[PDB]
mmCIF file of C-alpha atoms in Angstrom:
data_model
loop_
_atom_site.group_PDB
_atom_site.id
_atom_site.type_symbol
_atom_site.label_atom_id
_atom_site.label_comp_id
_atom_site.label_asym_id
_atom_site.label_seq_id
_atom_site.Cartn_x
_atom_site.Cartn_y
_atom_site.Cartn_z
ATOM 1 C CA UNK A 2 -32.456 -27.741 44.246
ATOM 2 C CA UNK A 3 -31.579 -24.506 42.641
ATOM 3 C CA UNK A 4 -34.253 -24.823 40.393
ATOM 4 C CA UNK A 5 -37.207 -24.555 43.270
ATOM 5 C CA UNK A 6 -35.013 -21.984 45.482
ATOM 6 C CA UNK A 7 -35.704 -19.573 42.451
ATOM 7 C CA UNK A 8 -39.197 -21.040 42.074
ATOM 8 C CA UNK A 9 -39.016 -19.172 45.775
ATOM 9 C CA UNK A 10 -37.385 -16.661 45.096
ATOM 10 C CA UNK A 11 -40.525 -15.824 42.449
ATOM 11 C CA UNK A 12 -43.313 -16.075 44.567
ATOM 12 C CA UNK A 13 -41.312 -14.181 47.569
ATOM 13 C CA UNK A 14 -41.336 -10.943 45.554
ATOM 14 C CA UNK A 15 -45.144 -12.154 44.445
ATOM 15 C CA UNK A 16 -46.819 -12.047 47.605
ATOM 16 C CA UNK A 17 -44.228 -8.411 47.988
ATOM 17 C CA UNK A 18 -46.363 -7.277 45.368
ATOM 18 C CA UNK A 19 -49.894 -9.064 47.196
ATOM 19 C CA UNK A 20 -48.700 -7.135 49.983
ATOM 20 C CA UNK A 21 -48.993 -10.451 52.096
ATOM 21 C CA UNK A 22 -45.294 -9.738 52.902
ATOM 22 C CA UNK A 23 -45.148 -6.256 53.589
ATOM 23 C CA UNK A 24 -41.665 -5.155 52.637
ATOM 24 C CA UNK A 25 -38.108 -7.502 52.582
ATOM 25 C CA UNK A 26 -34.765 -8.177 51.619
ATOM 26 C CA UNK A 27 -32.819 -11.041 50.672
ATOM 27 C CA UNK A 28 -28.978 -11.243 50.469
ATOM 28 C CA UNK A 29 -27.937 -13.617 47.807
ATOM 29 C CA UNK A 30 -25.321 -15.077 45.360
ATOM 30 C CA UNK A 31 -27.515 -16.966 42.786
ATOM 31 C CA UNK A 32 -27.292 -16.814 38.983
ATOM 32 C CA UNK A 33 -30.542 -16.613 37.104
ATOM 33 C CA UNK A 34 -31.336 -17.152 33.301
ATOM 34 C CA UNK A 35 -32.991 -14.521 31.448
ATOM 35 C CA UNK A 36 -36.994 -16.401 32.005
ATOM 36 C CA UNK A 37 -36.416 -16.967 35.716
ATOM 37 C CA UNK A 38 -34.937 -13.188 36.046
ATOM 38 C CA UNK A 39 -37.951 -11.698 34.219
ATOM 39 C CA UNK A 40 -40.327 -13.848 35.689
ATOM 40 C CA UNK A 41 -38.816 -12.421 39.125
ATOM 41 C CA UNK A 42 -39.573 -8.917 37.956
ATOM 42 C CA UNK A 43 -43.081 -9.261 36.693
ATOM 43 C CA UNK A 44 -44.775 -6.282 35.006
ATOM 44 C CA UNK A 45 -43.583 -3.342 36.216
ATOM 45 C CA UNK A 46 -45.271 0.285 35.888
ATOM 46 C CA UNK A 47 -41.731 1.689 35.296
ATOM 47 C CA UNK A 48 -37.859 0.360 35.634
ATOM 48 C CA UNK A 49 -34.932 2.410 36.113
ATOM 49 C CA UNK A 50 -31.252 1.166 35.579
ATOM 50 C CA UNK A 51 -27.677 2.414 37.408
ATOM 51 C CA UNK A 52 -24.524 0.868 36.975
ATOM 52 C CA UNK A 53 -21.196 0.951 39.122
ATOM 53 C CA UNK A 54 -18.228 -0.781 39.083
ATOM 54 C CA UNK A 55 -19.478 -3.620 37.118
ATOM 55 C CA UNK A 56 -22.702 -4.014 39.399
ATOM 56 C CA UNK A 57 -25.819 -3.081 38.414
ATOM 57 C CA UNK A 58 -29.042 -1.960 40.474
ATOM 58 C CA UNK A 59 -32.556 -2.156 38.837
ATOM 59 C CA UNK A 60 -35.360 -0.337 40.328
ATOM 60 C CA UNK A 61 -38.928 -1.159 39.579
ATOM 61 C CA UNK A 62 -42.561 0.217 40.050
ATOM 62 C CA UNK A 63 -45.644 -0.872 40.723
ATOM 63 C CA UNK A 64 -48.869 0.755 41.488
ATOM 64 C CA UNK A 65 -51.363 -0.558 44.313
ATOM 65 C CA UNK A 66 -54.201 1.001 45.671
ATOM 66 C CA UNK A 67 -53.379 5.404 45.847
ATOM 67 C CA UNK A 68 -51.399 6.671 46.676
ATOM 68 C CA UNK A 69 -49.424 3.052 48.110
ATOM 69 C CA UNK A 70 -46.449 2.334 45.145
ATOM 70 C CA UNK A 71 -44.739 -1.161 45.485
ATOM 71 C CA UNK A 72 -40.956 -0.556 44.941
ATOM 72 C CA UNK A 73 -38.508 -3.493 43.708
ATOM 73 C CA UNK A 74 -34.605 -3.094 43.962
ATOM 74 C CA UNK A 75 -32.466 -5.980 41.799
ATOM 75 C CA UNK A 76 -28.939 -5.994 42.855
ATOM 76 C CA UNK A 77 -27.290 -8.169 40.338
ATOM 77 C CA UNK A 78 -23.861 -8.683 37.996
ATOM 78 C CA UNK A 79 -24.386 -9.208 33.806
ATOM 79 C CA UNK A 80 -23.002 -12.994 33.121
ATOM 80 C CA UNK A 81 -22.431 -14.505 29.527
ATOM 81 C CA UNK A 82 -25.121 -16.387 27.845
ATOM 82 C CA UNK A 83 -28.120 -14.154 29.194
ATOM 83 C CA UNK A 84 -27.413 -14.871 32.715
ATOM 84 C CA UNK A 85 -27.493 -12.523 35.844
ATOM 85 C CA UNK A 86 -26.035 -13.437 39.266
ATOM 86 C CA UNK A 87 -28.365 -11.816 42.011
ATOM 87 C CA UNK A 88 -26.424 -10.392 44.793
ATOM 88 C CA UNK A 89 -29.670 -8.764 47.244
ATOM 89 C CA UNK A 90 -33.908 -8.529 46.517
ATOM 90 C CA UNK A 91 -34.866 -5.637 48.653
ATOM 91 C CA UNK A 92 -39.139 -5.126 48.577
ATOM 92 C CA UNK A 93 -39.913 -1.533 49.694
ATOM 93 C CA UNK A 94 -43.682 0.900 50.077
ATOM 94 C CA UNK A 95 -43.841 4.218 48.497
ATOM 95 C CA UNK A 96 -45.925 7.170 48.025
ATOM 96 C CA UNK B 2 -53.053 -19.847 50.519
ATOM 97 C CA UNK B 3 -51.915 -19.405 53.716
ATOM 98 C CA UNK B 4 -50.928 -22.802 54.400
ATOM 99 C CA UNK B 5 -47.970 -22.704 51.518
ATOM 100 C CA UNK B 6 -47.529 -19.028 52.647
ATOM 101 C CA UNK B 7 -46.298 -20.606 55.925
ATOM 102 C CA UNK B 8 -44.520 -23.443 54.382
ATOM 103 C CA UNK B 9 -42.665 -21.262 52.254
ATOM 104 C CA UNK B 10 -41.744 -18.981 55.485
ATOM 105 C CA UNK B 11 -40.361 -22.022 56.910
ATOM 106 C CA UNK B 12 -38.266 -22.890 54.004
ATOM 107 C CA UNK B 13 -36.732 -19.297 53.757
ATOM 108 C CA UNK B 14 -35.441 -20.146 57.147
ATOM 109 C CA UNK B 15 -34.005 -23.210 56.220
ATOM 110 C CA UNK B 16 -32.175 -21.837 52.992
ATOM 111 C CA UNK B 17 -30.932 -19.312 55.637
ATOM 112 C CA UNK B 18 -29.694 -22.013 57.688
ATOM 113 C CA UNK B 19 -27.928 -23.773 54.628
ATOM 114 C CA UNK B 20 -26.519 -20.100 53.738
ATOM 115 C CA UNK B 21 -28.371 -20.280 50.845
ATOM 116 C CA UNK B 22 -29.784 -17.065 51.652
ATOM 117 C CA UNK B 23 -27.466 -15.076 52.933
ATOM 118 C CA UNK B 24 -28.741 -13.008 55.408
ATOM 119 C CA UNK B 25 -33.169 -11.715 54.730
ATOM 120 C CA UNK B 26 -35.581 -9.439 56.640
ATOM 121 C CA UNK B 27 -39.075 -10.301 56.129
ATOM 122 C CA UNK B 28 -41.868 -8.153 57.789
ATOM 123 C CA UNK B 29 -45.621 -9.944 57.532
ATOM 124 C CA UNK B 30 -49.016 -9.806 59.935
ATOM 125 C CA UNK B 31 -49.620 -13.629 59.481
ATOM 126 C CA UNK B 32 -50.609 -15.988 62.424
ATOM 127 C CA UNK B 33 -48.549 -19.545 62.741
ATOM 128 C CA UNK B 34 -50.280 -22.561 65.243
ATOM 129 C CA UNK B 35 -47.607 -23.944 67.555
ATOM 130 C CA UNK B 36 -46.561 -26.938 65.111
ATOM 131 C CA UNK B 37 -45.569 -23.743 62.250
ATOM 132 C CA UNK B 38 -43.846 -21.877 64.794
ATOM 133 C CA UNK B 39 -41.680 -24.689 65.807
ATOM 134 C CA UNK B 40 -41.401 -26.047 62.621
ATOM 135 C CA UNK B 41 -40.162 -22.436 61.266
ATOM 136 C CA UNK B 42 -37.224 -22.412 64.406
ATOM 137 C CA UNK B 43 -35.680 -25.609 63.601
ATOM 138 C CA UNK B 44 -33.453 -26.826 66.543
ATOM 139 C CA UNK B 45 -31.251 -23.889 67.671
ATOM 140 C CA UNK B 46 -28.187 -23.965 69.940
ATOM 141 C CA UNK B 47 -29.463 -21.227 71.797
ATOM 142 C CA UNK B 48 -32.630 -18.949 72.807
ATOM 143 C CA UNK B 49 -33.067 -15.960 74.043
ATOM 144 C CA UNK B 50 -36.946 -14.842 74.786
ATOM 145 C CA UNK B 51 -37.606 -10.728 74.937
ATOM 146 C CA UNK B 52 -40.892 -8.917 75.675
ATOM 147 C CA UNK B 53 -41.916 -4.814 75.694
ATOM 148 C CA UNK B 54 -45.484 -3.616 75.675
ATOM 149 C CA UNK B 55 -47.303 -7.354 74.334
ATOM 150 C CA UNK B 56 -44.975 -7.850 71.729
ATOM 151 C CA UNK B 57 -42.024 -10.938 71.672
ATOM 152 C CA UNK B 58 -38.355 -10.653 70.340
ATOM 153 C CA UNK B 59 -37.122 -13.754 70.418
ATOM 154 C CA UNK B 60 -33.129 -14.447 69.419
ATOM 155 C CA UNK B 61 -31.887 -18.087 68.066
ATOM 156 C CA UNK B 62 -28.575 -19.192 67.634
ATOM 157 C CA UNK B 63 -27.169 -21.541 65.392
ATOM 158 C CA UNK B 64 -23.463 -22.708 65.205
ATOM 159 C CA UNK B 65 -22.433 -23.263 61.445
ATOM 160 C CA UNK B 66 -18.816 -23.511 60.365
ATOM 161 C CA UNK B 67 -16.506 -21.622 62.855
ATOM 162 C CA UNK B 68 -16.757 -19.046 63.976
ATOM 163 C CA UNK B 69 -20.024 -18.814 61.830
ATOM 164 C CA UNK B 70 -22.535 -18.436 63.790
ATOM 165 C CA UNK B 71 -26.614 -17.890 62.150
ATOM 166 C CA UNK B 72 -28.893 -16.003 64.543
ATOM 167 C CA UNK B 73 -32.631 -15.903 63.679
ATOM 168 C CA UNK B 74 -35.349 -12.808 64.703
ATOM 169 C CA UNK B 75 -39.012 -13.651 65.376
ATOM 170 C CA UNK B 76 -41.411 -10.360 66.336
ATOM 171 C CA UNK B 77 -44.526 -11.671 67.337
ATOM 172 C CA UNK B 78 -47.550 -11.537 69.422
ATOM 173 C CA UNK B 79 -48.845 -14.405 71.316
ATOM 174 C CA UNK B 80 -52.283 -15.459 70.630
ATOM 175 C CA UNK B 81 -55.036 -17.142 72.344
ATOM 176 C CA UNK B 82 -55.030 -21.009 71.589
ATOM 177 C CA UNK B 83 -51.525 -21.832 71.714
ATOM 178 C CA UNK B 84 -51.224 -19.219 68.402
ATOM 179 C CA UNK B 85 -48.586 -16.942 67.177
ATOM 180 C CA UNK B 86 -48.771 -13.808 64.739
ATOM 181 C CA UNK B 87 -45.803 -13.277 63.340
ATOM 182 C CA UNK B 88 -44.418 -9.013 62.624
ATOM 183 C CA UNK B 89 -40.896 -10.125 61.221
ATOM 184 C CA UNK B 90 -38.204 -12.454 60.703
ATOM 185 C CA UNK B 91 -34.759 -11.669 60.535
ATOM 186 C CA UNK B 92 -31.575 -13.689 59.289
ATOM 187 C CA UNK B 93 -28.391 -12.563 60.388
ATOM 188 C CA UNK B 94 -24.244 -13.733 60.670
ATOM 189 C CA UNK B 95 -22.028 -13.230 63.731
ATOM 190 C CA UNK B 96 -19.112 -14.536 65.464
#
């Protein structure tokens, strides 16, 4: 259940950053808890946050072999109790 | 490895199918034998097969809720041995 599609969720964005899936996006509607969002975002290199209208946009960094930058985009709402509801995972390549 | 990678391509389709996921883009370089590739289609209502300069397009169509309709995007190549590398998927929604 919703349990493993996050498990997927995960390892989508992993093998993003393995480059073994080149570049994506996923349109969603899940709610994640604070472990299972973080988990999701792995170490960046650097994070950036914007805010409008109540939704939020997170955009993170990560370095690969030069000058090839792995670029992470986290569409998502704030929820009580440490929760975020994911609305789109979009996996991007940068310079 | 590459035999969960595959698995776990299948399954994306299938939480597309359930609307689970939304709507995703996925672009890869992998290579699927025949049982994968079918396996990854599922049983659509409809297909359409399209072909410029070696590579495929092909367009499936599922009926969901009306007038919900799921169409599914494979790019690939066709490979010797009954194989298929696979450029991109694509989930979308139409009417």
């Amino acid at each position: 259940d919703t349990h493993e599609f996050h498990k997927l969720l995960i390892k989508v964005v992993d093998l993003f950053l393995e480059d073994r899936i080149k570049e994506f996006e996923l349109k969603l509607n899940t709610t994640l808890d604070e472990l299972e969002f973080e988990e999701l975002i792995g170490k960046p290199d650097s994070s950036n946050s914007a805010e409008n209208n109540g939704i939020f946009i997170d955009e993170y960094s990560y370095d690969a072999s030069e000058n090839a930058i792995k670029k992470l985009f986290v569409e998502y709402v704030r929820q009580p109790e440490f929760k975020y509801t994911v609305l789109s995972i979009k996996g991007v390549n940068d310079w």
